[PDB]
Design a protein around this motif. Sequence first.
Motif, PDB file in Angstrom:
ATOM      1  N   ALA B 123       4.825  -7.746  13.298  1.00 33.05           N
ATOM      2  CA  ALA B 123       4.932  -8.390  12.010  1.00 33.05           C
ATOM      3  C   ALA B 123       4.742  -7.487  11.198  1.00 33.05           C
ATOM      4  N   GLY B 124       4.867  -5.960  11.505  1.00 28.36           N
ATOM      5  CA  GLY B 124       4.777  -5.097  10.262  1.00 28.36           C
ATOM      6  C   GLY B 124       3.527  -4.446  10.100  1.00 28.36           C
ATOM      7  N   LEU B 125       2.273  -4.929  10.471  1.00 31.34           N
ATOM      8  CA  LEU B 125       0.843  -4.315  10.505  1.00 31.34           C
ATOM      9  C   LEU B 125       0.551  -3.402  11.172  1.00 31.34           C
ATOM     10  N   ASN B 126      -0.425  -2.657  11.057  1.00 31.33           N
ATOM     11  CA  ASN B 126      -0.955  -1.538  11.830  1.00 31.33           C
ATOM     12  C   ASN B 126       0.131  -0.211  12.256  1.00 31.33           C
ATOM     13  N   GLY B 127       0.849  -0.027  11.131  1.00 31.53           N
ATOM     14  CA  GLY B 127       2.139   0.997  11.337  1.00 31.53           C
ATOM     15  C   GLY B 127       3.267   0.320  12.232  1.00 31.53           C
TER      16      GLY B 127
END
Lengths: 147, 147, 149, 152, 147
Positions: B123-127
């Motif tokens: 979902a695009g979080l944490n890199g």
Amino acid sequence: DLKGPELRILIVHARWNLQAIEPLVKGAVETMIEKHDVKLENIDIESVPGSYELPQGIRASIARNTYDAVIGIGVLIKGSTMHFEYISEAVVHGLMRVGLDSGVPVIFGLLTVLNEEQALYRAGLNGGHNHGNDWGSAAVEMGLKAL
Amino acid sequence: DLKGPELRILIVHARWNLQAIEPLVKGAVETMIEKHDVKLENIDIESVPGSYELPQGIRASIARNTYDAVIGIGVLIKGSTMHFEYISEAVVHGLMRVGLDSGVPVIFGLLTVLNEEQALYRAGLNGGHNHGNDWGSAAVEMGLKAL
Amino acid sequence: SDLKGPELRILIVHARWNLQAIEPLVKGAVETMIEKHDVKLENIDIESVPGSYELPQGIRASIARNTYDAVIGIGVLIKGSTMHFEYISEAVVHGLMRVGLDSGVPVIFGLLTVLNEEQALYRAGLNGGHNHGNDWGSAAVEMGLKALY
Amino acid sequence: GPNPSDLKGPELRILIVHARWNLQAIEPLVKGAVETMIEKHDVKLENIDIESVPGSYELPQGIRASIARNTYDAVIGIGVLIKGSTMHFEYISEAVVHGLMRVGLDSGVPVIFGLLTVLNEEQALYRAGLNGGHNHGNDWGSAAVEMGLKAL
Amino acid sequence: DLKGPELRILIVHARWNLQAIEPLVKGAVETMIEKHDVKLENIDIESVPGSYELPQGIRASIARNTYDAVIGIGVLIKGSTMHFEYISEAVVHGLMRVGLDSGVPVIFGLLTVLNEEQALYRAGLNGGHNHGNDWGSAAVEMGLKAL
């Protein structure tokens, strides 16, 4: 916050594992009534022998009467054979077909577990959350969105 | 390169795991608008309780209004039972059927992961890369090719 | 093969994921149909879709607009860290079969379902492997002819 | 366990289509089904048609063909599949389970799944009532009667 | 005991693994003739490149001519990829649909093995039993019952 006082709901459940089925049906009903204003008279509760008959039980019923949403409830526990796997596969597809053919929302209230404990836990016993509540709310929401 | 200023896009997403869902819906919308010139007012965003209702939610909507493409978004995480496996199976087949029956392109924006981290990463979080962006472009492309 | 299809109209729909493997596959199919089966270049429509999941719908949409004797669906699916691979493969394999049986138009399954990149490349003719695109081109020609005559 | 009924279907017409592989297990199953419908549900012997097909894969087609010729209130598909050395088992099971479901939903005729999908012979015999087991045919017979009646 | 002198049978087989395919086709033909009195000129034998084309090859043929029963023959051996699993899945369902859609009995003569040896063994070589014989009898039986 969704209220469906004019909704007609159908509940078809299998009779295998009543120890687990009952809590599930109660949760569904109570939730619809107490939290969504569904009227008790508007909830039809029917049953079939096992989960395999769930799809045909539902199709037969929605052909005779009109419902805004349906909840198919059953409990399948993995046993010694491959029985569990094939029945689960057949029912999961069957319910989807009945819902898409009829245009009537069908809530998947089928537990596919490894043992009895997992089933009861998901019916609200032993510190678990009653999944029937969730299904009840889902039925109301889909019933209203179907208009 | 593909611009679809006259495209009407539908997005139906489940509400389970909003922490992952939101980024996915935002990405899809933002990409269609900023990168493909899709008009904000031409994007309908609806929702259903869980992923299992995704196929019915979509079938119902494309029967009331006309859309050039649809994006079905949901997040499924493997749990303790076989629930994950069967819901995934049913939804993947249900979406395909709804698309083939209607002739309307349906983009598969369903994440089928082993744990929460994998979902957030996609979902695009944490890199990680936001897959919603990809789905947004896919919808625009299919919407135009459908003419 | 000794089958010639100079009047055959072939459709090729491929996904754009893994162009490194997709291109050799498409080239193999086209070149084989042309050089070995006398299919005319102008009678081969090449279209694409973002990913393999759109393969079935991309095909259904195209065979509804134009007439083709055979279709080749091409895509590459590589097993990842999630269950994504298993479900997409399942949906596509069934979707293609349905599009073919519904339309009566032969659909050739040009989908690679591999565990890693090397397996895909090897099946596209790189690193000493055989290009499966060739086989798909011949299969398309044979089914095309058997569908008419 | 399961949960049958006391339901009586004296006017019901029941069809039973079974494969012929593993008669050692099939027979007990068919007998159980028939005997239970008669002795416990008042189904008339003349109203029970029993047909057969070579193997389980033909079960769906055999059923579809029969319900197109005559009228039945319920159908029971019976067969036994044992896991072997190849993947044959998995694919035949998958095809049959889906096939039966489709036939039942297309025709509107209840179809009872009387298919045993086991790992070995012992498991099949046990579910056919031998060696201390419970005959699943009985359950299928009651299921057929119940669905037959509810289908009105 | 079953004789079908007036039956018209169709045999569509893939060309992969002729070493195993041929014995299977021979077994089926010889059994129908020598043991069921099927006439050689009433047996159409067609072929397709691989097993994936089996369903379409059959559908196309039964649309042009009239047959009482059809036998789909092919050999699938597990390889290094997942190719084997998905092709098998597609064909097993495809044949079923073709048979149920047309009303024509379709005999499943597909071997889904882990290695070559298993295939040859089931084709009658190395002390095994030729499964082609069984399919031949199955086709004759289903053809007659179809009336």
